[PDB]
Amino acid sequence: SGLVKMSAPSGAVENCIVQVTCGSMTLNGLWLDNTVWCPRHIMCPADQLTDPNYDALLISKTNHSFIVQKHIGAQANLRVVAHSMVGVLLKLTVDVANPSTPAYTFSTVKPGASFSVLACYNGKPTGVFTVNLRHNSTIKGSFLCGSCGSVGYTENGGVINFVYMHQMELSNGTHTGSSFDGVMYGAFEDKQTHQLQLTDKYCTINVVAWLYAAVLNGCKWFVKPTRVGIVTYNEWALSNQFTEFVGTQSIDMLAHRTGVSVEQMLAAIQSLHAGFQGKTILGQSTLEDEFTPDDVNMQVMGVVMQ
Amino acid sequence: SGLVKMSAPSGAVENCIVQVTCGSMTLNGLWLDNTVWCPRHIMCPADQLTDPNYDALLISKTNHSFIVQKHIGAQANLRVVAHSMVGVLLKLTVDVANPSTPAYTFSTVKPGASFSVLACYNGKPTGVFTVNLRHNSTIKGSFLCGSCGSVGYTENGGVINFVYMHQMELSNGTHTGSSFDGVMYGAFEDKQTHQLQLTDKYCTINVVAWLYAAVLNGCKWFVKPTRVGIVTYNEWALSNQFTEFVGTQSIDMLAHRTGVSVEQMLAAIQSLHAGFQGKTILGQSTLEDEFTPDDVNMQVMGVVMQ
Ligand SMILES: O=C(Nc1ccc(N(Cc2ccsc2)C(=O)Cn2nnc3ccccc32)cc1)c1cccs1
Ligand SMILES: O=C(Nc1ccc(N(Cc2ccsc2)C(=O)Cn2nnc3ccccc32)cc1)c1cccs1
């Protein structure tokens, strides 16, 4: 038992991290087969970060403009033989394929989904943590500018699913990046101008999953006979910065295991939002919405007790 | 910017995880050079868990009683050629040296210290998270049956420092294990009986470090001119379940970088302990005490704002 923020083991991803340098800028890249991926703003000079003309920048670089180095494991200096833009990513073709390329897929996650982040700095892995894609398609992470190119991923059956490459900090503790098709998460441009973020919301289904984990972990003081219909909850949610609730088979099974209905959990959310009344749930006095039902399922399988 | 619970990248450790089986019991082991470590309760039958005679069990076992397999990476079946007891651990000698043994050291962490855990099942790494050794030398992690032998570690300059091998669950969300000298963390025995846990406390120096992190991340509403001396706070702490404060150079450096004194922070703790009053700090409504000064230092390196 116990519930903690958990990441997928990072070894397979660590083997793919490289350092990329262009002019005075350096950051991290991901080396898969004969390709190195990094944010395209590595091309932008310090004095043009406000209005970068990436097409002009691209054309002003040679293959030799890009120095790519592997620091950890079997070291390497990699020769770039082509460079092009893929959305807000630079795609560098190199003359050697990464022999430690894992089996992998690219995916784009949806708001409310979690993934692991390998934080990197100057081509070296430095930390691992887990984030959730927020309702406004930002993440709440921990990065420096030199952390750009850090990689978000999930893992299933030995296959690494790459979903995120870190691009920018939007406001304090608030970040975004792109999927590996080069599409930025959220309504965000890779330039140094203030950009307005859409309002964030609590992911209701994740909160519900968390309350079920709490109950399976012996914490049930917040469960009352009170219930609220989904239609009523959803009207309330629109006025209180929560997402609309739509049930899933996974949630139904947690209901089954605990004897606590989804309508009771939605009622508890409404009550807890008004105040925790000096009490805690799994150590917290705020609602937790970054565990998905899948995340919770991985960490439970205990029997509900008395 | 941003502050998250950060774990050390796990690749070097993943390369060292094996499965160990003895009779009907299986769990995880750590393979370094020609040695495999695992909890000694792998020898215990399910009907003798309340009072195992580990010396007798040891003698009844032979080298061939132990089956050791590596299921990931370069897979292998390892022959056990010696076995001996090391406190609550078994030390198995195997006939093949782990070719991916990292540079490593062993140490025993103190209450208030953090470390990373690679959670494993059937000899397969499954998750990474960070914990803090509690005042009563338990950890609040996330472990299921089959996780015994999971490995806790830190990183010291290209060196993996192993500090924990998972042994048991004590109560909901409450765990302990041993360092690799075979000494159990805390006043706990590796048997299936209810054991009393000494009272836990908030780690004051960690809470202080967290408040400093908050300030460096632009959260400062809780900082008042009020100041409480160390001696006075330490009197207060004894009666309010906080550890006594003892200054260190880390914290001093954080105090200098931010210009805010320890006494102001100790004062803030007293006030926040009474209640956050609707406001939040880094998104929380409770005091956070599992970031060490060192953990905070690694995630800061911005300039102090206003
Ligand atoms: O600094 C440089 N470049 C730089 C690159 C990116 C950034 N930006 C904003 C941005 C995105 C596209 S253009 C400007 C970050 O967010 C970057 N970013 N991404 N995550 C961050 C966390 C903290 C601080 C910054 C962070 C800003 C600057 C240098 C260029 C030549 C020599 S140095
Ligand atoms: O089950 C078996 N053995 C077993 C081993 C350890 C355990 N224990 C308690 C304990 C510690 C020393 S002796 C008994 C756990 O805590 C184990 N542990 N460790 N972390 C746990 C988290 C959740 C639940 C249990 C957890 C209990 C049982 C079988 C033996 C032969 C066939 S099966």
Side-chain angles (χ1 to χ4, degrees):
Chain A
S1 62
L3 185 82
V4 303
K5 270 289 198 100
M6 208 174 294
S7 303
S10 59
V13 182
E14 292 172 54
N15 290 331
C16 298
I17 300 302
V18 295
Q19 181 172 20
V20 189
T21 300
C22 186
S24 173
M25 181 58 189
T26 185
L27 42 67
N28 310 281
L30 182 74
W31 184 25
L32 308 172
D33 309 313
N34 67 325
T35 302
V36 170
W37 301 96
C38 70
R40 64 181 178 170
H41 66 60
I42 200 196
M43 293 186 300
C44 194
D47 65 310
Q48 293 182 325
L49 297 171
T50 309
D51 177 15
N53 181 341
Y54 287 105
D55 305 282
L57 290 172
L58 184 70
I59 228 170
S60 77
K61 308 295 177 197
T62 62
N63 290 322
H64 285 89
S65 297
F66 302 92
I67 304 99
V68 180
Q69 306 164 270
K70 192 182 196 297
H71 293 301
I72 68 182
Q75 292 196 321
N77 188 279
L78 304 174
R79 177 171 150 246
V80 176
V81 302
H83 61 286
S84 61
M85 284 188 297
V86 170
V88 296
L89 292 173
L90 248 186
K91 177 199 197 180
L92 304 173
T93 306
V94 291
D95 68 339
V96 180
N98 184 2
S100 294
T101 302
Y104 76 91
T105 60
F106 290 149
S107 298
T108 299
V109 300
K110 291 176 171 68
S114 61
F115 56 95
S116 298
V117 176
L118 181 60
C120 302
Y121 198 89
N122 289 348
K124 136 188 154 197
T126 191
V128 186
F129 59 95
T130 292
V131 299
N132 199 265
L133 187 65
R134 307 297 318 175
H135 182 71
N136 58 3
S137 289
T138 60
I139 62 169
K140 300 293 190 179
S142 182
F143 301 102
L144 288 199
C145 190
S147 307
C148 289
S150 295
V151 174
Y153 64 102
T154 61
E155 184 273 341
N156 194 19
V159 178
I160 300 300
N161 186 43
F162 291 110
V163 307
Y164 176 98
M165 174 161 280
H166 185 58
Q167 294 262 352
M168 54 192 178
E169 176 160 303
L170 296 172
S171 52
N172 202 278
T174 306
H175 304 107
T176 196
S178 63
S179 37
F180 282 84
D181 52 7
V183 174
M184 193 81 83
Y185 284 101
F188 302 116
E189 301 171 24
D190 52 343
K191 56 197 212 311
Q192 204 183 57
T193 56
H194 165 76
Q195 296 170 77
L196 261 155
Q197 314 168 12
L198 300 170
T199 180
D200 199 4
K201 294 180 186 208
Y202 292 97
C203 182
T204 295
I205 191 165
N206 289 358
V207 179
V208 171
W210 178 70
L211 294 174
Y212 277 121
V215 168
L216 286 162
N217 274 263
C219 175
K220 58 180 179 174
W221 61 265
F222 55 85
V223 177
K224 300 294 174 47
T226 319
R227 51 155 131 181
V228 63
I230 287 172
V231 63
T232 301
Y233 177 86
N234 283 343
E235 295 177 10
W236 175 89
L238 281 176
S239 300
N240 292 262
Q241 302 183 32
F242 281 77
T243 58
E244 299 278 359
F245 178 84
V246 175
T248 63
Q249 182 177 59
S250 284
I251 294 297
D252 287 349
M253 178 61 41
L254 288 167
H256 184 237
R257 289 171 59 183
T258 57
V260 177
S261 75
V262 174
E263 283 188 344
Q264 282 173 282
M265 286 311 202
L266 294 176
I269 290 179
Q270 287 185 312
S271 170
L272 293 166
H273 184 64
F276 269 57
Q277 292 147 8
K279 305 175 192 178
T280 58
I281 301 167
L282 290 172
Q284 295 184 217
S285 277
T286 48
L287 298 169
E288 171 66 67
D289 79 333
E290 299 217 340
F291 293 98
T292 69
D294 281 352
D295 295 338
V296 166
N297 278 329
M298 289 298 303
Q299 297 196 43
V300 299
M301 63 191 83
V303 322
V304 78
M305 278 279 146
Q306 342 168 25
Chain B
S1 76
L3 183 78
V4 304
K5 292 284 181 63
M6 181 100 53
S7 299
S10 59
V13 180
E14 293 172 51
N15 289 332
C16 299
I17 301 299
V18 294
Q19 183 178 10
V20 187
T21 304
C22 184
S24 269
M25 181 61 178
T26 192
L27 37 67
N28 312 277
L30 182 70
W31 179 26
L32 306 169
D33 302 318
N34 282 292
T35 299
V36 173
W37 304 90
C38 74
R40 61 171 182 182
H41 65 64
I42 194 180
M43 302 190 295
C44 192
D47 69 325
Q48 293 169 27
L49 293 164
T50 58
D51 194 35
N53 186 341
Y54 287 114
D55 311 284
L57 288 168
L58 184 70
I59 293 180
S60 73
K61 299 304 173 184
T62 58
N63 288 326
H64 293 91
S65 305
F66 302 93
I67 287 89
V68 179
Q69 297 190 280
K70 186 195 230 265
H71 296 308
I72 63 168
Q75 294 197 31
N77 173 264
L78 307 173
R79 245 208 332 136
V80 178
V81 301
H83 60 288
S84 61
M85 270 225 282
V86 179
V88 297
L89 294 169
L90 283 181
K91 182 176 176 177
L92 317 176
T93 305
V94 293
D95 60 349
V96 179
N98 183 359
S100 295
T101 305
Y104 70 92
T105 59
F106 297 117
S107 84
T108 297
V109 308
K110 289 174 175 61
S114 68
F115 57 94
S116 301
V117 177
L118 180 64
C120 306
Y121 297 84
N122 296 313
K124 176 190 185 55
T126 59
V128 195
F129 55 94
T130 306
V131 297
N132 199 274
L133 193 63
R134 305 302 315 170
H135 185 74
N136 57 12
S137 295
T138 58
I139 61 174
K140 304 287 171 179
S142 177
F143 300 97
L144 289 311
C145 62
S147 63
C148 299
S150 291
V151 171
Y153 65 97
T154 64
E155 201 273 352
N156 294 337
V159 176
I160 296 301
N161 180 65
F162 293 106
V163 304
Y164 179 96
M165 175 160 273
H166 185 57
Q167 293 270 349
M168 60 192 151
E169 179 161 303
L170 294 168
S171 56
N172 286 336
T174 301
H175 310 100
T176 191
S178 64
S179 40
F180 283 83
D181 50 7
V183 178
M184 194 80 68
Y185 283 104
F188 307 103
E189 312 180 346
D190 57 339
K191 64 214 302 181
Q192 197 177 59
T193 57
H194 189 276
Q195 308 179 61
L196 289 177
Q197 301 170 29
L198 278 47
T199 317
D200 203 358
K201 300 181 170 192
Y202 295 96
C203 179
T204 291
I205 192 175
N206 289 2
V207 178
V208 171
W210 180 68
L211 294 174
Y212 277 129
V215 170
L216 286 169
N217 276 267
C219 188
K220 64 178 171 195
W221 67 262
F222 58 86
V223 173
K224 288 142 283 135
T226 316
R227 299 173 179 77
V228 178
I230 299 179
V231 179
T232 312
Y233 172 87
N234 281 348
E235 288 195 316
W236 175 89
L238 279 177
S239 311
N240 291 272
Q241 289 189 261
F242 282 78
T243 56
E244 77 152 284
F245 180 81
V246 174
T248 74
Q249 208 218 10
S250 307
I251 297 295
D252 275 359
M253 304 160 101
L254 282 172
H256 261 176
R257 294 175 60 179
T258 192
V260 178
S261 57
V262 172
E263 293 81 5
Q264 286 187 268
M265 288 307 198
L266 298 177
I269 287 176
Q270 286 179 328
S271 187
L272 291 163
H273 182 54
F276 272 55
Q277 309 150 355
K279 306 136 217 47
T280 54
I281 305 176
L282 299 184
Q284 292 184 39
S285 297
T286 58
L287 294 180
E288 171 66 54
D289 81 332
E290 295 212 339
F291 291 103
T292 69
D294 288 336
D295 297 335
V296 163
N297 281 325
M298 295 298 302
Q299 291 189 58
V300 298
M301 60 194 77
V303 128
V304 80
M305 295 296 106
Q306 154 189 254

